[PDB]
Amino acid sequence: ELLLDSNIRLWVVLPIVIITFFVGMIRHYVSILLQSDKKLTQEQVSDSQVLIRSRVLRENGKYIPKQSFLTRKYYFNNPEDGFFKKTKRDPTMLTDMMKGNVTNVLPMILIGGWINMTFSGFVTTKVPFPLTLRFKPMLQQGIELLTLDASWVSSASWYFLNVFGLRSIYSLILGQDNAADQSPADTNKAFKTEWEALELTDHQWALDDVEEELMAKDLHFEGMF
Amino acid sequence: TLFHFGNCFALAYFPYFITYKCSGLSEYNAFWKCVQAGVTYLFVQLCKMLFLATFIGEFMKASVDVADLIGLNLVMSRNAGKGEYKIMVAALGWATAELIMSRCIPLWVGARGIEFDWKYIQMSIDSNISLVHYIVASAQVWMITRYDHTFRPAVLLLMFLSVYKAFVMETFVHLCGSWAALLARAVVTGLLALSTLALYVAVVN
Amino acid sequence: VTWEEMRDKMRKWREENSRNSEQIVEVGEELINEYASKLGDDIWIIYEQVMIAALDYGRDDLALFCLQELRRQFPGSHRVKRLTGMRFEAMERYDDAIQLYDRILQEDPTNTAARKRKIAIRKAQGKNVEAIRELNEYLE
Amino acid sequence: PFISEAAVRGNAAVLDYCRTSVSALSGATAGILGLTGLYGFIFYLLASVLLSLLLILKAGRRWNKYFKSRRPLFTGGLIGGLFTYVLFWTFLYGMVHVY
Amino acid sequence: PSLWKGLVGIGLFALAHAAFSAAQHRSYMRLTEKEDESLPIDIVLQTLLAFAVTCYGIVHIAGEFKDMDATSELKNKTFDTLRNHPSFYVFNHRGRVLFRP
Amino acid sequence: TRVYPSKQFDVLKDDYDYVLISSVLFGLVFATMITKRLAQVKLLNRAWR
Numbered sequence: 001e002l003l004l005d006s007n008i009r010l011w012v013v014l015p016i017v018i019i020t021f022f023v024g025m026i027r028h029y030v031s032i033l034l035q036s037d038k039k040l041t042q043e044q045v046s047d048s049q050v051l052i053r054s055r056v057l058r059e060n061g062k063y064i065p066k067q068s069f070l071t072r073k074y075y076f077n078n079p080e081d082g083f084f085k086k087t088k089r090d091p092t093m094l095t096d097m098m099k100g101n102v103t104n105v106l107p108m109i110l111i112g113g114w115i116n117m118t119f120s121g122f123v124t125t126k127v128p129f130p131l132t133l134r135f136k137p138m139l140q141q142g143i144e145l146l147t148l149d150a151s152w153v154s155s156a157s158w159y160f161l162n163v164f165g166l167r168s169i170y171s172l173i174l175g176q177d178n179a180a181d182q183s184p185a186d187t188n189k190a191f192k193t194e195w196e197a198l199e200l201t202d203h204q205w206a207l208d209d210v211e212e213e214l215m216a217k218d219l220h221f222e223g224m225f
Numbered sequence: 226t227l228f229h230f231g232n233c234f235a236l237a238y239f240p241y242f243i244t245y246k247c248s249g250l251s252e253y254n255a256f257w258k259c260v261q262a263g264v265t266y267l268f269v270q271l272c273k274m275l276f277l278a279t280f281i282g283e284f285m286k287a288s289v290d291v292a293d294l295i296g297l298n299l300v301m302s303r304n305a306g307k308g309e310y311k312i313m314v315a316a317l318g319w320a321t322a323e324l325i326m327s328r329c330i331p332l333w334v335g336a337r338g339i340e341f342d343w344k345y346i347q348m349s350i351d352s353n354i355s356l357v358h359y360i361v362a363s364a365q366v367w368m369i370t371r372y373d374h375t376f377r378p379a380v381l382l383l384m385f386l387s388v389y390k391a392f393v394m395e396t397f398v399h400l401c402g403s404w405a406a407l408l409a410r411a412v413v414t415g416l417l418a419l420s421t422l423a424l425y426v427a428v429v430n
Numbered sequence: 431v432t433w434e435e436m437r438d439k440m441r442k443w444r445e446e447n448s449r450n451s452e453q454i455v456e457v458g459e460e461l462i463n464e465y466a467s468k469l470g471d472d473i474w475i476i477y478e479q480v481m482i483a484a485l486d487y488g489r490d491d492l493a494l495f496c497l498q499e500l501r502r503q504f505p506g507s508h509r510v511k512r513l514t515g516m517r518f519e520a521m522e523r524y525d526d527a528i529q530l531y532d533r534i535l536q537e538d539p540t541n542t543a544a545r546k547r548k549i550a551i552r553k554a555q556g557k558n559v560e561a562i563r564e565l566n567e568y569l570e
Numbered sequence: 571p572f573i574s575e576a577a578v579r580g581n582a583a584v585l586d587y588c589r590t591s592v593s594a595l596s597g598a599t600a601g602i603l604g605l606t607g608l609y610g611f612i613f614y615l616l617a618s619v620l621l622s623l624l625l626i627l628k629a630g631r632r633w634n635k636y637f638k639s640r641r642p643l644f645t646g647g648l649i650g651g652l653f654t655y656v657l658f659w660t661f662l663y664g665m666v667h668v669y
Numbered sequence: 670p671s672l673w674k675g676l677v678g679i680g681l682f683a684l685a686h687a688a689f690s691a692a693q694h695r696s697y698m699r700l701t702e703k704e705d706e707s708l709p710i711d712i713v714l715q716t717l718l719a720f721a722v723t724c725y726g727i728v729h730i731a732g733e734f735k736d737m738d739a740t741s742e743l744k745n746k747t748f749d750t751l752r753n754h755p756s757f758y759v760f761n762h763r764g765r766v767l768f769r770p
Numbered sequence: 771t772r773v774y775p776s777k778q779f780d781v782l783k784d785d786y787d788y789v790l791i792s793s794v795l796f797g798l799v800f801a802t803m804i805t806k807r808l809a810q811v812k813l814l815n816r817a818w819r
Contacts, residue, residue, distance in 0.1 A: 003699075006669055007782045013664065015791060022802050029805040033812055042540060046570075118787075123780050125664035128606040144776050165657030168590040168650045176583050257631050264627055264725075271722045275683055278715065299670075446746070447753035451764065471814055485760055488768035508819050520760050546756040554761040577735035588731045592724060598684070599720045602691055603713065624728045636734040666691050 002152075004123065012124055012155060016115065020162040023111060024170050027104075028180035034100070047087065047187050051194055058198050062206035069203045077195040084195050088188045105182055112159055116141060119155035127151040229345070230336035236349040237324055237332070240356060241317070248313040253306060255314050262300050262318020263325070269296035270326070286392035293319070294388065297366045308367055316363040320356050328352050347407055354411050357418045362388070364421040368428060380424060387417060433465030437472070444479055455483035459492065474500070478513060485520040493517060508534055512543045524551050542568075581636055585625065585646050592621045593651030594658050601662020614655040618648065673729040680723025687716040 054076050061069040077084045120142035131139065131150040139150065139157045153161075163182065170180045184190045245255075273289040280288065300315050328348055336345050365384045368377070394413055398406040436457045443454050458480035462473055481496040497510075497517055504510050511534050518527040528551060531544035545568045553561040596617035600610045622643050629636055629643075637643070690712045698705060 002668075002780065004668055005781050008780075009665060009669055011782065011786065011788075011791065015795065017661075018795065019798075022798055025802050026798070026805060029802070029809045032809050033805065037816075040540060045540060121777070121779060121783065125660060126668050127660055128601070128604075128610055128663045128667075130607055143779050145779060161657060161660065165653045168647075168654050169594070172587055172590050176586075261627060261630060268722060268725045271718050271725075274718060275679070275715075275722065446750045447755045448750060449753050474814075474818075482755075482758065486758075486764055488765040488770050490770070504815075504818055510818075516758070516760075520765075522761070543756065550757050550759055553757075554759045572739040573737045574735075574739035574741070577739075577741070578737050580735045581737075584732050584734070588727065591727050595720060595723060595727075599716065602684075602687060602716055603708070621724070624724065628728050628731065629734060633734075635736045635738065637737070662688075666688065667695060669692075669695075 002123070002126070008122060008124060012119055012122055013158075016119075016124075016155065016159050017162055019111070019115075020159065020166055021169075023107075024163075024166055024180035025174065027107060028170070028174060028178050031103075031179040043089070044187075047191075048184065050087075051184075051187075051190060054194055054198060058201050062204050065205050065207070066203050069205075073198060077198050084191055087191060104179075108163055108182060112156055112163075115159050116154075116156040122155055123148075123152050124155050124158045125153055127153055226339065226341055227337045229341065230332065233332055233336060233345045233349045236346065237329070237352045240353050241321060241324065244313075244317060244356065248317070249310065252310055253304075253314065255317065258304055258314045259318040259321060261303065262315055263322040265296045265300045266293075266319050266322035269293050270322075282392060282396065283389075286389045290389040290392075293362070294366070294385070297362060298369065301363075301366050301370065308371065312360070312363040312367055315366065316356075316359040319362070320359045323355055323359070324352055328355075343403070347403065351407060351410065354414050358391075358414050361414075361417050361421045364425060368424060371428070375427075377428075384421070384424070387420075390414070390417060433461055433468045436461055437465075437469065440476055440479070444475070449486065451483040451486035455480060455487045455489065458483065462496075474503070478509075481513065482516065485516060490520060493520065508538060508541060508543065512547055515544075515547050519547070519551055519554065522554070524555065527551060582642070582646075585642060586650075588621065588625065589618075589647045589651045590654060592617060593653075593655045597655040597658025597660075598662045600655070600659040601664070602666055604663060604667045605659070606663070610659055614652060614659075617655075618651065619644075673726055677723055677726040677730060680719050680726055683719035684716065684723065687712055687719060690715070 057069075057072055057076075061072065064072075075081050075083055079085065123140075123143060126149070127139075129151065133150050136148075136150050139153045140148065141154045141156050143152075143154055167181050170178045174180065250256075269292040272292045273285075276288040276292070277285045297315050297319065300318065301311055304311055304314055306314075328351075332345055332348065335342075365381070365388070368384065369381055390413060391410065394406075394410050398409065440454065440457050440461065443450070443457075448454065458476050461476060462480060466473060477496045477500055481493040484490060484493040484496070494517075497514060500507075500510050500513065511530060515527040515530045515534075518524075518530065528548055531548045534541055534544040545564070549561050549564045549568070552564060593614070596614050599617075600613050603613075605613055625643050626633075626640075633640070691708065694708060694712065
């Protein structure tokens with residue numbers, strides 16, 4: 001094998017892991033710190049909640065008798081009622097959203113480049129599986145060897161593997177669905193599509209057969225204590 | 226001596242099958258419960274090996290006994306039902322683990338060949354009495370549980386002290402024949418069995 | 431009986447909207463008197479309930495303490511503003527509470543707490559019809 | 571009947587947590603053992619199915635109210651586990667076998 | 670039980686010791702340079718046992734599963750609680766007058 | 771003497787910035803702590819408004 005310098009472990013292997021871990025934490029914390037809710041007026045939240053109610057009605061009107069459901073239908077999408085008809089109305093925001101979307105991967109690539117410069121010329125670890133030779137130019141950046149096994153990796157690709165393998169850990173410790181990783185606007189069209197969808201929907205009162213399906217079995221009663 | 230291996234297997238496993246079919250397995254379908262008990266027993270064995278490495282014979286035996294008792298208590302708390310039946314679901318799982326442990330693998334590697342040592346049939350006998358030993362252990366666990374009264378803590382402490390009786394008898398036999406030693410272990414295990422059933426008839430109230 | 435146990439009990443008693451003002455106010459007082467520093471900011475929401483229970487319990491003495499602590503901690507906060515409104519309503523002080531809620535609404539129009547508290551004031555005043563009308567309008 | 575999103579999300583979260591932990595531990599173990607090449611990869615697979623059984627043990631009987639089917643037990647987050655397994659395998663094989 | 674937590678610690682500790690052993694054994698090779706290329710059986714057995722026990726502890730540590738049926742936790746929710754409406758509280762009840770003002 | 775036909779690829783460089791790597795590590799752990807505190811404070815303020 002190869003008698004690698006022990007100091008390469010104490011100053012090039014572990015620091016990379018620590019950097020990746022804390023950079024992920026930093027990135028997640030900066031993401032949550034930067035996020036500020038945009039102010040919403042009454043109309044937008046009102047229409048969003050109205051279409052929410054309409055959709056949940058479409059979803060589960062089955063537990064509601066037919067007349068209540070078709071009265072709901074009349075109220076929402078029907079000329080006479082009026083509802084769903086008389087219900088309608090470098091930029092800073094684009095730059096901000098583009099920067100926010102960019103800051104999820106670009107900092108990682110910049111850190112990788114900085115590491116590649118800072119830690120150029122080493123052999124950090126041997127990958128325990130026989131990688132292909134064609135992957136040599138990128139795994140062994142900063143190494144002048146020619147016949148070296150492809151399983152030996154430079155600092156940059158080791159950092160890349162580290163950053164690839166730590167997202168699950170981030171979700172494990174930081175919390176579920178953390179932001180440290182690598183990866184309605186229009187109501188008129190929404191109104192019309194809700195109109196069409198709830199027009200297409202039908203009714204099936206799920207209570208039409210609850211009694212018969214209840215009479216079959218006795219009521220659970222144990223554990224009353 | 227494959228047919229001897231057959232005879233020894235008939236001696237060891239079949240009483241377990243008999244207990245399985247005579248203890249109302251269909252009451253809970255204890256295959257899953259037995260599997261959980263066996264996993265716990267394997268874990269306890271792993272813990273005992275680790276503890277022995279960490280930490281002459283009495284200390285190791287005490288650690289193994291403590292781990293087994295703790296595992297049995299945890300397994301018992303894992304399930305709810307008939308007291309005799311939790312007794313069964315614990316004891317049967319642990320006993321199956323013991324047979325499946327290093328008292329079946331030597332029976333496979335040894336035996337079935339040309340040699341004939343009484344050790345295999347003796348091991349089968351001892352495994353069969355291990356059934357009642359684990360019955361005793363489960364009785365002790367149930368006594369620890371099932372409320373507290375009538376000098377119950379004194380009896381529980383005495384029963385806990387009586388655990389690791391196998392190591393004590395082994396030490397005595399080492400200081401002191403193989404068939405004689407096996408017989409002595411059988412009689413002491415039977416004495417503990419009768420003590421535990423006496424406790425059971427005392428506690429039924 | 432450790433502060434974690436009563437803390438969990440208060441958390442549960444908050445999770446489900448109970449109204450045993452006596453028990454919850456006693457437990458909150460014990461936590462904020464004995465184990466105030468035993469845990470961090472998690473008592474702060476308690477400092478809300480503790481006063482509300484107080485307003486339900488009538489023991490207004492610690493309501494001022496909780497309110498002053500929250501206000502000194504959270505200046506210009508809509509939550510503390512609604513809480514002051516409830517404090518005012520505890521003594522049927524309705525005009526000042528209504529003015530405060532109106533100020534909250536003009537400061538933030540999407541707030542729903544002010545509307546709920548003001549209709550609560552209206553229904554406490556006995557104007558059931560106008561309360562129904564106000565709820566219908568607010569739901570709109 | 572009426573599935574609750576919070577409970578199913580919690581079950582998914584705990585399963586994912588267990589998978590991630592077990593995969594990391596398996597990677598550490600494979601790096602310890604000095605497994606190299608395909609023989610390492612196979613080890614990961616073994617650990618996984620073992621975990622399912624263990625998950626099966628944790629769920630045990632009457633698991634039907636926890637999940638609709640046993641499928642998430644088998645293939646839940648396998649690639650996410652594989653990434654951490656290979657990471658820990660390289661990590662441990664580096665700080666054990668390389669030096 | 671909480672003791673489960675303690676267990677997992679020792680598992681890692683056990684594993685940690687194995688690591689030391691492995692390192693030392695590696696040094697052994699790095700000082701023996703013979704065609705052994707094999708770990709001692711004791712150390713590997715120790716490592717495997719540590720892995721097994723630690724995973725077993727983790728299994729307990731993962732937590733408890735939750736039932737999917739939404740009507741599970743709502744069974745014990747009596748109507749005396751859901752009706753309180755904490756936002757719409759009213760303080761014109763007999764509680765204030767009856768109790769110390 | 772010694773010769774490095776491959777520029778001594780397997781040895782740490784003599785010009786390693788210990789005082790920079792250690793500085794960034796120990797000025798970044800404190801940064802992580804501070805930003806966690808900041809995130810907690812902002813979350814609490816947003817929760818209470």
